[PDB]
Each structure stands twice: as structure tokens, then as C-alpha cells.
Design a protein around this ligand. Structure first.
Ligand SMILES: c1ccc(-c2cc3cc(-c4cn[nH]c4)cnc3[nH]2)cc1
Length: 288
């Protein structure tokens, strides 16, 4: 048909975000997975002070576009408390850079790992509930803007001041207004992917929820690797398709495990929505 919902992520880069590279000074390397580095940015404030930011870059081609992808998606979504904030981008004379909010504690996965012994500036059950709650809200927001993240995991969740969680790395994110599915034609997070994504290459709101389930398992297991000791081979894919699922992690309240189980239903339609998840966790928090 000749009649289309316009996808904002496919529109041209809006130079409202453009930022002079002269006004950036690169610090330490912050991650590699491209790479992000800490920097100070002049002129982002009305009073014209310097502020600390995180800049996402590439090394000297599909990752070239994945960065442009991530940028247009962030630009499209706008600002939310539970998403890494886009602050600007450099696209002129030089390599493409993406400036975003700096999260002082880094990824949630290594945070839970550092804090694993201190558990029970320590960690306790109420923090993990909060992380549950915030991440589901950030996800419910993406779903509200017809966006699927497609790489939901503890490694892609940053923790900032105030124990606030932010979703980051939108390289694989898509906007699914026109079609109810998304079919892909790269390297992928198998142990976080829904079956229909592995077997038929389809991605939907329901497949993000599946990833959210695996994330909870990461979360209540204090940063343990999914399907521990299980290599990604033929043995793995069968067990998935036959219906086998991880068991409850050590510190997961029974009703939080019930949420993982419904996120892992082979039937996408029997999975809950992020809207429903946010309601569930909110009631669990109240009863305390
Ligand atoms: C210690 C070590 C590392 C960090 C840290 C990582 C990180 C990553 C992003 C990021 C932006 N886009 N994608 C990812 C932002 N801030 C960060 N901060 C903080 C304390």
C-alpha cells in the first residue's frame, strides 16, 4: 500500500543535537562492547559551565549505522527518567560521536557483582525490587512509543546518582509502528532472546518482555550468568523449545519468580505487558 506510518528513526539526522568537538576533552575509557569515554563538555548549560558526559564512539561497517540508529532512536524517544539521556552528537569533520548522560556507577551487572557479598551503601531486597520496578517502567515507556530494545540485559542498564536505573545501548532498537513484527537479517544475545526470535527471527513487544524475564533472573541472582555452564549449542536450543526454563534465583520473592515464568511462556500472547508488570511490582512493593 501507498499509505505509511512515518518512522521517525528513518528520518534525517536533526542537527539540533550537533555539538562542536572542540568543546569536548576526552578522559578515561568507560566501556567496550563500541567504546564509550568520559569527557567534559563546554556550553551544554545556559550559564555556560563545563559538565561531565559519556561519549560513545567507534574504532576505525554495520556498527557505523548501529550508532546512527541508536542516536535517532534516542532523539525520537525524548527524555525519560529511566533511559540514558541523549545530550548531543558530533557528525561533521571527524568520526561520529554520541554524547549522553554519565552514570557514575556504570553498568548494573558489575554493580550487583561488586555488591554481592555486601548484600543483605550495601544492597538489600528493596533495592532489587526498585531495580525491577524502574526497569519495567523504562520498558513500558519504550513500548508506549512502539519501540523494542532487543538487547535488554543487566549489562545494558546503568545505575546513576540516587540508585536510579537507566536503560542504555539502543544499537539494536527498532520502532515497530507499521508492522506488528520485526524480522532481522548480526551477533546476538542468544541467552536473552525469545524462542521466536531465535527460531523465526521475529522481534515484538512480547520478545522484549522475555528478555525482561531473563534480566530479573540476573537481578535476583546478583549478577549471575543465565543458564549457568550451558554453552550455546544444539543441546541449548532444544531445551528451550521443549520448554525448560531457569529455576528461581536465590533471593527472588515467589511473586517475582511468577513474573519471570510468565515472561518465559512459549506463547508470546500469554506473556504480560510491561504495563501489567509495573502494576504487579508496585503492589508487591506496597505490601511491606
Ligand atoms: C565506573 C565505571 C564506569 C562507569 C560508567 C559506564 C558508563 C556507560 C555509559 C553509557 C552511555 N551510553 N552507553 C553506555 C554512561 N556512563 C557510564 N558510566 C561509571 C563508574
Amino acid at each position: 500500500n501507498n499509505y505509511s506510518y512515518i518512522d521517525p528513526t528513518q528520518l534525517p539526522y536533526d542537527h539540533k543535537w550537533e555539538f562542536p568537538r572542540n568543546r569536548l576533552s576526552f578522559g578515561k575509557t568507560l566501556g567496550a562492547g563500541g567504546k564509550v569515554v568520559e569527557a567534559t563538555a563546554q556550553g551544554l548549560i545556559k550559564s555556560d559551565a563545563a559538565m561531565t558526559v559519556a561519549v560513545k564512539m567507534l574504532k576505525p561497517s554495520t556498527e557505523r549505522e548501529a550508532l546512527m540508529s541508536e542516536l535517532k532512536v534516542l532523539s525520537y524517544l525524548g527524555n525519560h527518567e529511566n533511559i540514558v539521556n541523549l545530550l548531543g552528537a558530533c557528525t561533521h569533520g571527524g568520526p561520529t560521536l554520541v554524547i549522553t548522560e554519565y552514570c557514575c556507577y556504570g553498568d548494573l551487572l558489575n554493580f550487583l557483582r561488586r555488591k554481592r557479598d555486601s548484600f543483605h551503601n550495601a544492597l538489600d531486597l528493596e533495592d532489587l525490587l526498585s531495580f525491577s520496578y524502574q526497569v519495567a517502567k523504562g520498558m513500558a515507556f519504550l513500548a508506549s512509543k512502539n519501540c523494542i530494545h532487543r538487547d535488554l540485559a543487566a549489562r545494558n542498564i546503568l545505575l546513576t546518582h540516587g540508585r536510579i536505573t537507566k536503560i542504555c545501548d539502543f544499537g539494536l532498537a527498532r520502532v515497530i509502528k507499521n508492522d506488528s513484527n520485526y524480522v532481522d537479517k548480526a551477533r546476538l544475545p542468544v541467552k536473552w532472546m525469545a524462542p521466536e526470535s531465535i527460531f523465526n527471527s521475529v522481534y515484538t513487544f512480547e520478545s522484549d518482555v522475555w528478555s525482561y524475564g531473563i534480566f530479573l533472573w540476573e537481578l535476583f541472582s546478583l549478577g549471575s550468568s543465565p543458564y549457568p555452564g550451558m554453552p550455546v549449542d544444539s543441546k541449548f536450543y532444544k531445551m528451550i523449545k521443549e520448554g525448560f526454563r531457569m529455576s528461581s534465583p536465590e533471593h527472588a520473592p515467589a511473586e517475582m519468580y511468577d513474573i519471570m515464568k510468565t515472561c518465559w511462556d512459549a506463547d508470546p500472547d500469554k506473556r504480560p505487558t510491561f504495563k501489567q508488570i509495573v502494576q504487579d511490582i508496585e503492589k508487591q512493593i506496597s505490601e511491606s
